[PDB]
Design a protein around this ligand. Structure first.
Ligand SMILES: OC[C@H]1O[C@H](O[C@H]2[C@H](O)[C@@H](O)[C@@H](O[C@H]3[C@H](O)[C@@H](O)[C@@H](O)O[C@@H]3CO)O[C@@H]2CO)[C@H](O)[C@@H](O)[C@@H]1O
Ligand SMILES: OC[C@H]1O[C@H](O[C@H]2[C@H](O)[C@@H](O)[C@@H](O)O[C@@H]2CO)[C@H](O)[C@@H](O)[C@@H]1O
Ligand code: CA
Length: 712
């Protein structure tokens, strides 16, 4: 690293403390007293303490007046030498935050007449906006510093179509960067772009969603969903593929939009659509990536658009896709990544205000609770502002219906409750949830938005890994098995999950209310359910495995809480044994519409389970108190579980409902709790056309589920 030649060093580590570092073989030359100078300034600096390091001697000096940011400062030694005051740790202090917190809008504010530019850089000494445009003369103008450390400049003319960059001067080193609030960018996100309002109109009004336990989530990646040669869609792997109506596979099976609507799902959860790194937008087929490498939080990814060179195109297509799903009665959830950025050192945050936006350990080095290099410090006031500003923007400008927070456990509770307030006001009924794993990040345990603190985050949901592992088997030991795979040691944990995970017997509650429990058995992370089971049960044929996976679905789909499904799970999706496919090729990640064809019958079974849940509110109790009054366990053995829903007058259309889950191939007899005749609605074979009546006892033959009901 080349660098500015300096006599010695000096940093501002607090609102009134300056740390002076002098090189070893100069200790006797560059000595105290020291003085802080600037235009019209010259005060003395007292020494509180001094001690030697391994290459330098250090002084911790104090000043009578608080340093004033925005102007260049000079530190003078008795020997006459000088050096420029650099930025220290003062940026992470509460005193600094309170002094510079800005509540207005930031970024590029457009008008056909003129454009106003604003950026928050409280510790810088200068700033400028750099404008360019293909064949149109480039210009760079100096910005003026205002209150709260905000720099701005107003440029006359219509700037639609112009590219822009900010130049921020920190520690006498100028850096170039795109606007953190950029709403449009060039190919591969090299620069931001100014664009007039696109005047997009939303023509598919949807009323506020009734309640969380009334939803059915379907997780999918935009490229995976339609890249297969037999997807029946024209815009393969693009935003527009999901807009294509009445699409079908070669053999005539339903696909795309028509397919998702037929299944009965209510919300479609998409993997990251903000601009990320990992795929060359100029040559998208050369690489693949899930999208968890944030570059620009306020703009869309380019590889999913028809044309990534025209700044407006990607925006238009994402909005059309979303509007179209709305027209067909489907809602949208956005996976968002506010816990880290890709390459911290080159990020807009770091180049504008060095060291402010990332958490640090006691040594003064970036923490790594995320495990990928950096942790965004949500607790800083402008960071919290940013996250809330971002969530509201997507809601207002893209009209989505909820968010899935990646690594929710890294964010702080106050920031989460603050954005929740603003988001629900902008869009009543949206869904808000995430993974609240306990992670090693520098925050007191009670301040993390982790699962353990669910009681303090009402209105926020969490992925239920307890229920997940109980049904499938521990996901960190390939060979481990769960109830669905034949392990009776976890049957009680399963009953707990069926009851909404809000307390059972001597088992402590996972969450306070069912609306906070996202029940699932598969996701984009780890082995798919089919692949994991294939490793744990190496001696079982395909027929038996299929029945165990259908069993895992019935357990989840008929449980109290919020059901969540991984795209392709319905037809035993496989990834060739790959455990972490974040960058694998298409042959590994694509949604196989050939397999959806082969197992149309098993997909039909899932479709019927979703229809049942929808037609009977008994499977959708609104609170822990109500569940306590209408749900009770009847039988609980190593391979057999039976519970029932009762007292369903005002509630359900049926009077009594009994559900039996069997996890072994043998055949057994089960005694009903009474002698009244019931209707056999379903058994290990599947649903029955025109229910037959049985009395006192019923047979449970092989792996599967049997459902009995009594009408009114
Ligand atoms: O290139 C940077 C980074 O890439 C790799 O990390 C990726 C993980 O391997 C991959 O599993 C994925 O992880 C994310 C989960 O899918 C998501 O559910 C949630 O848990 O967030 C995770 C990360 O934020 O994505 C990451 C990032 O691309 C590689 O392993 C790292 O060493 C490397 O630093
Ligand atoms: O054309 C600009 C922008 O307009 C709309 O966004 C509005 C939003 O509807 C209002 O509620 C309020 O928040 O102001 C926003 C911006 O002015 C569209 O929703 C959006 O797609 C479009 O880009
Ligand atoms: Ca990109």
């Amino acid at each position: 690293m080349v660098s500015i030649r300096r006599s010695f060093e000096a940093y501002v580590d607090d609102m009134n403390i300056i740390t002076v570092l002098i090189p070893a073989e100069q200790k006797e030359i560059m000595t105290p007293p020291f003085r802080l100078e600037t235009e019209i300034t010259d005060f003395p600096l007292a020494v509180r303490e001094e001690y030697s390091l391994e290459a330098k001697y250090k002084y911790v000096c104090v000043s009578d007046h608080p340093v004033t940011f925005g102007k260049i400062h000079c530190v003078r030694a008795s020997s006459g030498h000088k050096t420029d005051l650099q930025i220290g740790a003062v940026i992470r202090t509460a005193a600094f935050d309170d002094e510079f917190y800005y509540d207005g809008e930031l970024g590029a504010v457009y008008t056909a007449d003129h454009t106003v530019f604003k950026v928050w850089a409280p510790a810088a000494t200068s700033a400028a906006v750099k404008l360019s445009h293909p064949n149109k003369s480039g210009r760079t103008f100096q910005m003026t510093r205002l209150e709260k450390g905000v720099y701005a400049v107003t440029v006359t003319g219509d700037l639609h179509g112009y590219e822009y960059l900010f130049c921020i001067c920190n520690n006498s080193e100028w850096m170039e960067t795109v606007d953190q609030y950029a709403k449009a960018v060039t190919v591969n996100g090299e620069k931001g772009v100014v664009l007039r309002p696109d005047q997009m109109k939303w023509t598919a009004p949807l009323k506020p969603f009734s309640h969380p336990v009334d939803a059915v989530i379907y997780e999918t990646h935009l490229r995976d969903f339609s890249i297969h040669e037999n997807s029946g869609m024209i815009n393969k792997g693009k935003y527009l593929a999901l807009t294509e109506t009445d699409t079908q596979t070669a053999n005539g099976s339903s696909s795309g939009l028509a397919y998702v609507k037929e299944l009965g799902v209510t919300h479609v959860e998409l993997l990251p659509v903000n601009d990320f790194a990992g795929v060359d937008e100029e040559k998208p087929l050369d690489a693949y990536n899930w999208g968890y490498n944030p570059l620009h939080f306020f703009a869309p990814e380019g590889s999913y658009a028809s044309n990534p060179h025209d700044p407006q195109t990607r925006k238009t297509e994402l909005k059309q896709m979303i509007n179209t799903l709305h027209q067909h009665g489907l809602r949208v959830i956005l996976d968002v990544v506010f816990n880290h950025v890709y390459k911290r050192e080159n990020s807009p945050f770091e180049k504008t205000v060095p060291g402010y936006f990332f958490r640090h350990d006691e040594c003064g080095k970036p923490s790594n609770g995320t495990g990928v290099g950096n942790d965004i410090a949500s607790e800083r006031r402008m960071a919290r502002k940013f996250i809330a500003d971002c969530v509201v923007y997507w809601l207002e400008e893209y009209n989505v219906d909820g968010f899935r927070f990646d690594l929710l456990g890294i964010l702080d509770i106050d920031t989460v409750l603050y954005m929740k307030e603003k988001a629900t006001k902008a869009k009543p009924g949206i869904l808000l949830f995430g993974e609240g794993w306990d992670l090693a990040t520098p925050l007191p345990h009670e301040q993390k938005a982790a699962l353990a603190n669910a009681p303090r985050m009402p209105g926020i949901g969490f992925f239920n890994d307890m229920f997940r592992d109980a049904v499938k088997g521990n996901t960190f030991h390939l060979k481990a098995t769960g109830f669905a795979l034949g392990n009776g040691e976890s049957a009680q944990a399963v009953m707990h999950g069926i009851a909404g995970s809000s307390g059972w017997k001597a088992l402590a509650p996972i969450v306070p209310e069912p609306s906070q429990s996202i029940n699932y058995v598969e996701s984009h992370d780890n082995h798919t359910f089919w692949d994991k089971m294939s490793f744990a049960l190496p001696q079982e044929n395909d027929s038996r495995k299929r029945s165990r996976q259908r069993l895992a679905v019935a357990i989840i789909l008929l449980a109290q809480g919020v059901p969540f499904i991984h795209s392709g799970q319905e037809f035993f999706r496989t990834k060739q044994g790959v455990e972490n496919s974040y960058q694998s090729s298409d042959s590994i990640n694509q949604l196989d519409w050939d397999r959806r064809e082969t197992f149309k019958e098993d997909v039909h079974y899932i479709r019927r389970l979703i229809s049942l849940r929808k037609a009977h509110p008994a499977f959708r109790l609104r609170s822990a108190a109500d569940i306590q009054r209408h749900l009770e366990c009847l039988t609980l053995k190593e391979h057999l579980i039976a519970y029932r829903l009762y007292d369903l007058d005002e509630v359900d259309e049926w009077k009594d409902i009994i559900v039996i889950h069997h996890a072994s191939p043998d055949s057994v007899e089960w005694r009903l709790p009474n002698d009244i005749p019931y209707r056999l609605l379903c058994d290990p074979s599947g649903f029955q056309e025109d229910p037959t009546e049985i009395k006192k006892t019923v047979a449970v033959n092989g792996i599967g589920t049997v459902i009995l009901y009594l009408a009114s």
